[PDB]
Ligand binder design. Structure first.
Ligand SMILES: [Zn+2]
Ligand SMILES: [Zn+2]
Lengths: 166, 166
RNA sequence: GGCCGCCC
RNA sequence: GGCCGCCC
């Protein structure tokens, strides 16, 4: 019965307060909450874990580690979904700030964000389209694509070599 | 029916391969797996999150972040249990290495470690005693105690000020 | 922050 | 790596 006003929030690093993106760029992909703002990568450091995920999916590859570019806090993980690299920001690494309300809060779960702060809808085709080529516009961002491509390649090889048993 | 041989393992940083401690120093405290080797702190970087845990316990305080001192990977969290500061290492940040077997493995859960690698028993009084003054022997370690004491102080104040409502 | 269970 | 539930 208690509905929020679905305001716009800034999503900030809870360690150094740098802003990653606005709330309206969060979209879900089957319970995975991802950022579909192509500018977000500028604010993220991408680094290989040098270990393939134990969850081996073709559609939904958990790949490189993502850190705040400023302070290097671990803020989530990059995925490859439907051929597209996407940042998944951890809700516990964020602070949500609303300017007009003069309010700032943390939340323990993304479902708490949806309940208390702002609505989050399912990502659709245009969201994947706008993110597909987001990493080819800055030298820093091109180096990040190299990491992701390498992790994705090893992920695919691990899945192929396990399927060799079957 | 399939029993392991309960060998000694080195617990190493999965990012940089620095050794934190031996397996025989892991002990559990009510499903929390902690390190009771007083030398381990030398290998850990302690940093305030500057945010009190949402789990407010008198007996079991989750406190400062712990990182590998060498490579700064997030490897767990420090707790205060029974008046004692203890490192809790994340099982997913470790690689387990057994020299005589010539073997090295990751595990996804501490219960998998117990099932496949080595037994882990409940911590007892002498374990807390040996850890009580582990942070007063190096300049680096004394600075770590300052962080922990500050986080514990704010934790206690947060719990006291919430209990003010009741 | 942790444990275990289920699911992706 | 994530989701949700329970527990510490
Ligand atoms: Zn930051
Ligand atoms: Zn390390």
């Amino acid at each position: 019965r208690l509905r929020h006003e679905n305001k716009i929030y800034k999503l900030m690093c809870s360690n150094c307060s740098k802003e990653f993106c606005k709330s309206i760029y969060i979209k879900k992909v089957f319970s995975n909450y991802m950022v579909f703002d192509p500018s977000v990568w500028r604010f993220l450091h991408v680094e290989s874990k040098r270990k393939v995920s134990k969850y081996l999916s073709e559609d939904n590859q958990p790949l490189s580690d993502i850190k705040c570019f400023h302070c290097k806090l671990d803020v989530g993980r990059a995925y490859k979904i439907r051929g597209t690299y996407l940042p998944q920001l951890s809700v516990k690494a964020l602070t949500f700030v609303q300017e007009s309300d003069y309010s700032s809060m943390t939340k323990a779960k993304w479902s708490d964000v949806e309940q208390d702060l702002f609505y989050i809808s399912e990502a659709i085709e245009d969201d994947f389209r706008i993110m597909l080529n987001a990493l080819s516009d800055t030298e820093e961002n091109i180096e990040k694509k190299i990491v992701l491509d390498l992790d994705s390649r090893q992920h695919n090889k691990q899945l192929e070599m396990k399927r060799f048993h079957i």
